[model samples]
Target chain A: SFVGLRVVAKWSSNGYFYSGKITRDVGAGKYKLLFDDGYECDVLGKDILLCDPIPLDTEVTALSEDEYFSAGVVKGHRKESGELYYSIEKEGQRKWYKRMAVILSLEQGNRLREQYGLGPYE
Target chain B: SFVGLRVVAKWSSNGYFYSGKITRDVGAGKYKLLFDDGYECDVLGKDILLCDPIPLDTEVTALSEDEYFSAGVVKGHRKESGELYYSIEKEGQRKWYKRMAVILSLEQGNRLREQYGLG
Candidate 1:
């Protein structure tokens, strides 16, 4: 039943997780998800509480740098860090910054941003 | 000193192996190789008998099928199979065939093509 559904990240009543189309039922309540970006991951059925799609090119602001007005594009996410990073292009130079010190432009300084958006750096 | 040298597969007096550029000296006699296609592997310094470059798009012939004149293009290689696969475009369809069941067009049936030239 979870097959062919576009999914995004969401927090459960206890914790957080995500996935994509259910390619295979691995049994014991686990499903293999084939992401649109060609990567794959296994997720538990109970842990997949929500289904949504997030844009890869969302505009964001870097909190690590002194200037909060600088905008960047979400390039990709890292598996090891479990954090999203954005690529900022300035003066013809490009680099990736961690999501820990960045805020989404769509939900900045708002309540909904506080609930579902990327949280601030610890 | 092995850095920046383009390497291809070669058989030594003992065995066969290959690499790209020596990225790091991994202690002892082992060195890390960074291939042009972004893959990495470790090789022994003494085992690296020669340095050369192989093309990815070399033409080849599939021997599995009866018609030997059919040509294919080298696409990519498989680590587990240890064989180079070529993409054969025919009748508006495409598929990959392994190197073992195929011979390179450059080295087909000729004696000069049998040694050192993709031998």
Candidate 2:
């Protein structure tokens, strides 16, 4: 289920999480990941923390376009060719933005973290 | 300016930003990035989007100590051994959290994106 998905997976060498995309399944409970800098390796699922979607209706206060600190809410999300985007709404207008653009507030970030059984956002 | 920091960088080949850490400076206006999967290459500054901090007083709806969507505020930040953390406050209690844990609001995320001018 991880093919072509971008995620941070534990590197066996140092047990550090490195960012990369899962290219394909290589069996033995391992998936092949291609790191951003160009390295590749097969890793297991336990060490991976994928880029999960921002929960719906998240309150945001910065919508660029000189819109400056305007509150935006996440209404929906969808995937395209492996890229993820969320439908965001502001002042009743909805716009679609890429996943990288979907940062969460510290508390909300921590919520996702805890939900994943990880640590908190300080 | 990006040595040893985790960031998403534009790969020269496909023009897509990939997550990795800047391992060192290799001259030629390029910094070597060691991606999560073990890939390494030199990239330019204009192509990198660093993991910046959530501004002070940011309202957070999640703090997770069975705290569940509790409001938290960012107050300060510091780095240790190359890792970044923010001092967050909730119920007047402060805690230090890692950068990976400091996820920003979508709106806040867009703000950082525009500031970096990466499109």
Candidate 3:
């Protein structure tokens, strides 16, 4: 059974990517990552290769059985090494997720961190 | 007078293409091309350099002086010769437009017409 697990990955081009705590795995691999708008690439393990620690300010809360939680992406990658990101939103939730490409480099990661001002390391 | 004219184009790869009637031209070079859904590429002046006659069934109606008739594209082209097309929608209108590439061949045009069941 694939629970809906919101797995957050912090990767860099230098192979330093890691997943965050499973806030709420909806049982079935189908999960939802919740975060702000600008964290589109920082959250997803995009380009480069390595990943950083998931930012704390970003959180994916648990949903009640009765409460419905939709899935969306802040960033998306159509091919293997694309630079696109999806800014997805749930049906009624206020948060969103960032699905970065898997081809970003460490330099790109650092630049993104500085650019988006993503604090709360790990 | 720069009236709101919706110019619809129907181009072919063999250099046999044309535009539909200008129901209205909204002054300046600003106008809308209204058509149906599947004609994204059958309209624009995309790739292929050649163009066919504009399709008929398609129409771009005029809005009243107070009514708002926004613009949209059934197909879009980013560069000079790209395959991508846009399926656009207006603010409060129902019809759409076909923005074909200037790079399509007569063969491609015929195939498109047949594939989309564009009668």
Candidate 4:
């Protein structure tokens, strides 16, 4: 039961990188979360990464056709080498990028500012 | 703005005093919370209480015609007198009771065992 644990959405296309706590444990690896904004949404258990204890930082670069390389933060990871990914937020938009050929910076980023900070990416 | 803060349901009829964290602020005093069991439910802002820092203890007796006085835990309070209440959980069922003629014990109870210590 992942209920009440903080979680971040793994899919960048969803733009739900902001952490939310699990509210309901739906069967079949499905669960519901209540975001900080007073909104609730259902997500697959495999679709979110636990955010408790471990902070969400770790900067990475994703490939974007329009902007070449887009800088974002790593929201989740997979055991598969190419499955690791980041949720890229740029200009009020969010997108997902696979770990394939992506650059993961060694330096850690600010978790509070990087994950919950609202505003357009500079 | 109640997001992330732990809250308890004020209504005993709801059986949600177990505590949950506010996930979404649905506006108009309506908010969403995720319970410790991974179950989410919507509650009116006035229907819940901030549970952070303060532990949910304090045993109180409520008047239940079926069971006489039901012993339960104080889950919420109201600034106005007679509004204080408790959420009584008995036999896996929950019921609400007002401060009117309710008995509040002077002793404190174990919060962990009473609140989130699930079966």
Clashes of each: 0, 14, 88, 14
lDDT of 1 by residue, A32-86 (tens): 6653322345655544423232345545554332344466655555444553444
**Winner by TM-score between candidate 4 and candidate 1:** 4
Query: DockQ for all models, in order?
Result: 0.02, 0.13, 0.02, 0.01
User: Per-residue lDDT of B6-103 in model 3, one digit per residue for the tens?
Assistant: 33344332343333322334443322333221122223323111122322322222222222323332332232243222333346343322233222
Error of 1 at A41 (Å): 2.8
Better of 2 and 4 by lDDT: 2
lDDT of 3: 0.29
Who wins the TM-score comparison? 2
Expressed as tens digits, the lDDT of each residue in B43-83 for candidate 2 is 78766668544467765433332443345778888988875
**Leading candidate by DockQ:** 2
lDDT of 4 at A108: 25
Higher-DockQ candidate of 2 and 4: 2
Model 4 B-chain TM: 0.44
Compose the digit string of candidate 3's lDDT tens values, residues A1-122: 11223333443323432233223333333223322111112233222112233332222221222223222222322323542233333453433222321212333334445434323233
Question: Model 3, stretches more than 4 Å misplaced?
Answer: A1-122, B1-53, B56-58, B61-119
Q: Name the runs in model 1 displaced over 4 angstroms.
A: A9-19, A54-122, B1-119
Model 1: per-residue Cα lDDT over B1-119, one tens digit each: 65666544222322323334567777787767654323345666654433222335545454332344466554555444443444655444566554333343423222223333221
lDDT of 2 by residue, A1-122 (tens): 66777765555554345446789878766678765434456777655556545457765433333344345888988989986667889878887765434444444333333344212122
Best by lDDT, which number?
A: 2
Q: What RMSD, rounded to one decimal, does every model reach?
A: 17.0, 15.5, 20.0, 18.7
| Alpha-carbon lDDT, every model | 0.44, 0.58, 0.29, 0.49
Off by over 4 Å in 2: A1-51, A60-63, A119-122, B1-119
